């Protein structure tokens, strides 16, 4: 095992005279996946700019000036390659998966997109109504509105509070211009990363990129990367009620440290302890995760998930459960009790497993090419370089009990949480109560 | 305390001069009686004008609470056996005398034998000791019936729309009230102890000296008034009885299509 | 509701403790003491209260206040007796009540 | 659509002077809880007396 | 000589249940009739009223009313339940009668 | 940073809080009495026996 | 301190009388709690085996 890790090939990295960082992991696999990952999200938008990046995503594929829609689509389909992508609050990306016999072709396709989207005044107007619709579909997914609302209130009044898709007004009116304005402002080499994994050999990649990414920086701005305005967390709640729904959704959380910070490992290990449930499990005997056990014994919920979603300089460490109108309270009671237990009286027997369960994730985090690429893409972009499983190992292979406590309690104990809840939530006690559910009557 | 014509008055006095912190305890108890009525009177009020009384059962028991709290406070003031204690007992008790036929025989049995004397101080003391526990008993029933329905509110319209956990909030809220109202109690209790107490009740009871102006404690006056309003001794008692018992009728005299009288300026001045 | 004996906040308390209350069929006669113990209490409190109404609690009047209660207070003698002897009925019962529980493991 | 919803402004309106964005709420609140609890700590204290 | 219409308007503004933002009908005490009545009320209205009533409890909770602008004007008060409440009452008196 | 120092050291742990409610009380008592008595007595110079004492105990 | 001051004398007859008058009501109070807890479970029975079979 340790050897298996030790024998895992290093991930080549190198920046251009441009600013783009080109990294990759050579394997053998006849297939592979390459793509660019941008240092851009909704976080970077304005009150009037917000949604661009997304409006933009829906056009990124519909063709370039160098080769219109009918073609781009035809050329990719024709080579059996897959082009897909996404955009969060601080992180966007476009990736392709082909037979590593096409690094050069893929690489070119990529560039041609992150640099020359047609932005056909005629296509735009179409996607405009496609989103407004797609948006009204994202809506009934109470599992997502809830998180949005969480962020909303959690980081109320700041860039983070804005949802990645954006208001209908913005989408109804963004101009062919604004989109261009968003592209030419954030899609710059210094903030972008060209990553890959497969049978591809670094050099052929570099050159190929160094060839199609012919960007040139004049001034110093171009060459530099602007740091964002800090986001203020706020212990608060938001309740979107409607007994009209089948069941309720709840999400509570404290502020997170941020990528850079190490503790995100100990903290990542703690969540592995409370883990997650889901009525399709087979386990009233689930190892620890009493929250799950209890959830089963007393029928506390349909499911729940522990999460340490983080950003550049902040984040959200919390949990979210889906439950029936009548078991909302106990569930919250029992869970919120686990955080305390977590940081007030944890045990080695627990952390031991915690670790293992993580390591197994940590590894399956890299199952395939597309996913690996995702790490290189991210890692660089958010951490600075790449963290080898061999490393993550140690980092989280030396977390003892006392370590979990010290930290969890450092981030959870007597902190003013941020809760959000849509659906039939009459039974969810007031803030004050969930608040004083943040300190154990030790 | 000793409940006997010959030791009562001094047992109390002794309690004040000899029993450590005895003086304070007596004061608190005496003055407390008033804090008690002032509150019970503001409690009635609030209900009378938020139509809280529409919760009949919880309200009817409340009337029983008032009657009980009274009795216990009438028979409790005799104990110190001072001029007013005695004379008050003799005049107010003798009232039943008006009740035709089975009248005299009641009073004449109520207290000792022929007049407020030892055999009644005892039964009064006993009664005084017992009733308060009955108050507490009933007070439980009161809150039970209450809890059946929610608690009423100022705007008199369904609160279900948004309730709040008592403790986190109201516990604090009430404890605040407790101090805000308990401070004057003590200021009064500690600075003007006798502010509300008849001096004539510092003279050991003496059946050969009827004081001029025999009147029950303030919290009874309003009725003492309505009592001597109608001349015919009989009717007088009835007026008295009705002055309080009318509370049982309030719920049947509600006509407004609205519960409270927040949005009822007319009746508001009437109130 | 129909019954109007199972809906009322207070009757419902009674109809659930002295009626409609599920009791085993084979209950022994030893179970008759809880009952007795309770009525034993009602009795004491009564006779006592009624007896306290003639007592004086003072070194110089106690003994005779009781004596007087017996020689002067109508049916006073009976009331004192019942109260005194009642104290015993009370313990005899409470002792048989313990017993029954000790050997039916009621204490579990 | 929920995306169309913002949280009103408590800024100034209610927030204590150590709370206005672009500044970590956390550096300033162990101080904010310190006060409150102090007030409560004092009451329990005065009350015991 | 003096319009009940002049009066009614006097009382309306006198009562003041509008400074809280709620219709007349938002205040009728919920006895048996009003209960049936509200249950027949269309969902549009039910939720409308529900919010109003809660927005009023909250003002009242804060000891603060609604700005003059938002005060419902006499002539715009919508008797949303009276029609219903009416049938309920005559439906009942019909039965209170037959059973005799 | 008292307040902050306070929280960290005294008000964070349910344990610590109670413990300073006591030590805090002992100190409050001793200090609050003296002070009150003082204020009291001073507003009454030469009236209290504590003041008239010496005349008869010699002086 | 229990009794008066230095020996069973007047100051204790009083507090005893008082105590005597008070406690019985506390008995009744608690007696309610007793039956409450009882009622939680059924009533036990001589053969000590589940009575549910027929109450
Ligand atoms: C009998 C013994 C009587 C004598 C006892 C003496 C006590 C003296 C009375 C002091 C009264 C203080 C009143 C301060 C009032 C402040 C105020 O004017 O405004 C009134 C006010 C606010 O109006 P809203 O419409 O709800 O506001 C909208 C919500 N934000 O609320 C006040 O009701 C509740 C007032 C209770 C009145 C206290 C009266 C107590 C006596 C009456 C008991 C009568 C019942 C019959 C017989 C008694 C046996
Ligand atoms: C003189 C020396 C005396 C020493 C004698 C010994 C007694 C020692 C004191 C023991 C008490 C330790 C206190 C433990 C309680 C603290 C607590 O756990 O919960 C606090 C708690 C919640 O506040 P938070 O800010 O949320 O606390 C969060 C803490 N991180 O609840 C506390 O209210 C209630 C505190 C009392 C304040 C309210 C006052 C009530 C008193 C009424 C006035 C009447 C007094 C007059 C007579 C009384 C008879
Ligand atoms: C010593 C006896 C009494 C005590 C301790 C007592 C106690 C209470 C308590 C604990 C409440 C809850 C809080 C509140 O609404 O104020 C209450 C409610 C109530 N009491 Fe009493 N009460 C007493 C006497 C009375 C009297 C005399 C009346 C009747 C004339 C009365 C009428 C009510 C009603 C109607 C409610 C209030 C419902 C509401 O408006 O929300 N109570 N009482
Ligand atoms: C004056 C106080 C007491 C009264 C009035 C009282 C009353 C009762 C009542 C009403 C019952 C129900 C009938 C029965 O099972 O006998 C009961 C049950 C019980 N009491 Fe008491 N009790 C008293 C004292 C005690 C004592 C001293 C004990 C404990 C040592 C005790 C133990 C029990 C238990 C275990 C049950 C019986 C459960 C069973 O076997 O079915 N009781 N008591
Ligand atoms: C729990 C029920 C009670 C028990 C176990 C009990 C037991 C006794 C006992 C042992 C005596 C002595 C009888 C004698 O002189 O030989 C007594 C006396 C007395 N009890 Fe109780 N008692 C009870 C309740 C009460 C209550 C509640 C009152 C009235 C409020 C009361 C008032 C007195 C009085 C005045 C005496 C003195 C008169 C006398 O002893 O004849 N008793 N009681």
CSV table of N, CA and C and ligand atoms in Angstrom, one decimal, chain C residues 44 48-49 51-52 55 66 80 83-84, chain G residues 17 20-21 24 27, ligand 5:
chain,number,residue,atom,x,y,z
C,44,UNK,N,-57.1,10.7,57.6
C,44,UNK,CA,-56.3,11.3,58.6
C,44,UNK,C,-56.4,12.8,58.4
C,48,UNK,N,-57.8,15.0,61.2
C,48,UNK,CA,-56.7,15.8,61.8
C,48,UNK,C,-57.1,17.3,61.7
C,49,UNK,N,-57.5,17.8,60.5
C,49,UNK,CA,-57.8,19.1,60.3
C,49,UNK,C,-58.9,19.5,61.3
C,51,UNK,N,-59.5,18.2,64.0
C,51,UNK,CA,-59.0,18.1,65.3
C,51,UNK,C,-58.1,19.3,65.6
C,52,UNK,N,-57.4,19.7,64.6
C,52,UNK,CA,-56.5,20.9,64.7
C,52,UNK,C,-57.2,22.1,65.1
C,55,UNK,N,-57.0,22.6,68.8
C,55,UNK,CA,-55.7,22.4,69.5
C,55,UNK,C,-55.0,23.8,69.7
C,66,UNK,N,-56.1,19.3,74.1
C,66,UNK,CA,-56.5,18.0,73.7
C,66,UNK,C,-57.5,17.4,74.6
C,80,UNK,N,-60.7,12.3,68.0
C,80,UNK,CA,-59.4,12.1,68.5
C,80,UNK,C,-59.1,10.6,68.3
C,83,UNK,N,-58.5,9.5,64.8
C,83,UNK,CA,-57.2,10.0,64.3
C,83,UNK,C,-56.0,9.2,64.9
C,84,UNK,N,-56.0,9.0,66.2
C,84,UNK,CA,-54.9,8.3,66.8
C,84,UNK,C,-54.8,6.9,66.3
G,17,UNK,N,-45.9,21.1,65.4
G,17,UNK,CA,-47.3,21.2,65.0
G,17,UNK,C,-47.3,21.7,63.6
G,20,UNK,N,-46.3,19.0,61.3
G,20,UNK,CA,-47.3,17.9,61.3
G,20,UNK,C,-48.4,18.3,60.3
G,21,UNK,N,-48.8,19.6,60.4
G,21,UNK,CA,-49.9,20.1,59.5
G,21,UNK,C,-49.5,20.1,58.0
G,24,UNK,N,-48.5,16.0,55.7
G,24,UNK,CA,-49.6,15.1,55.1
G,24,UNK,C,-49.9,15.6,53.7
G,27,UNK,N,-47.6,14.4,51.5
G,27,UNK,CA,-47.8,13.0,51.2
G,27,UNK,C,-48.7,12.8,50.0
H,5,LIG,C1,-50.7,11.8,57.6
H,5,LIG,C2,-51.7,11.7,58.4
H,5,LIG,C3,-51.4,11.9,59.8
H,5,LIG,C4,-50.8,11.1,60.6
H,5,LIG,C5,-49.9,9.9,60.3
H,5,LIG,C6,-51.0,11.7,62.0
H,5,LIG,C7,-50.7,11.1,63.1
H,5,LIG,C8,-50.9,11.8,64.3
H,5,LIG,C9,-50.5,11.2,65.6
H,5,LIG,C10,-49.5,10.1,65.8
H,5,LIG,C11,-51.1,11.9,66.5
H,5,LIG,C12,-51.1,11.6,68.0
H,5,LIG,C13,-52.4,11.1,68.7
H,5,LIG,C14,-52.3,11.0,70.2
H,5,LIG,O1,-52.2,12.0,70.9
H,5,LIG,O2,-52.2,9.8,70.7
H,5,LIG,C15,-51.6,13.1,65.8
H,5,LIG,C16,-52.1,14.1,66.5
H,5,LIG,C17,-52.5,15.3,65.9
H,5,LIG,N1,-52.6,15.4,64.6
H,5,LIG,FE1,-52.2,14.1,63.2
H,5,LIG,N2,-51.7,13.0,61.9
H,5,LIG,C18,-51.8,13.1,60.5
H,5,LIG,C19,-52.4,14.2,60.0
H,5,LIG,C20,-52.9,15.3,60.7
H,5,LIG,C21,-53.2,16.5,60.0
H,5,LIG,C22,-53.0,16.9,58.5
H,5,LIG,C23,-53.8,17.3,60.9
H,5,LIG,C24,-54.5,18.5,60.8
H,5,LIG,C25,-54.2,19.5,59.9
H,5,LIG,C26,-53.4,16.7,62.2
H,5,LIG,C27,-53.4,17.3,63.3
H,5,LIG,C28,-53.1,16.7,64.5
H,5,LIG,C29,-53.4,17.4,65.8
H,5,LIG,C30,-54.0,18.7,66.1
H,5,LIG,C31,-53.0,16.4,66.7
H,5,LIG,C32,-53.1,16.8,68.1
H,5,LIG,C33,-54.4,16.3,68.8
H,5,LIG,C34,-54.2,14.9,69.3
H,5,LIG,O3,-53.1,14.3,69.3
H,5,LIG,O4,-55.3,14.3,69.7
H,5,LIG,N3,-52.9,15.4,62.0
H,5,LIG,N4,-51.6,13.0,64.5
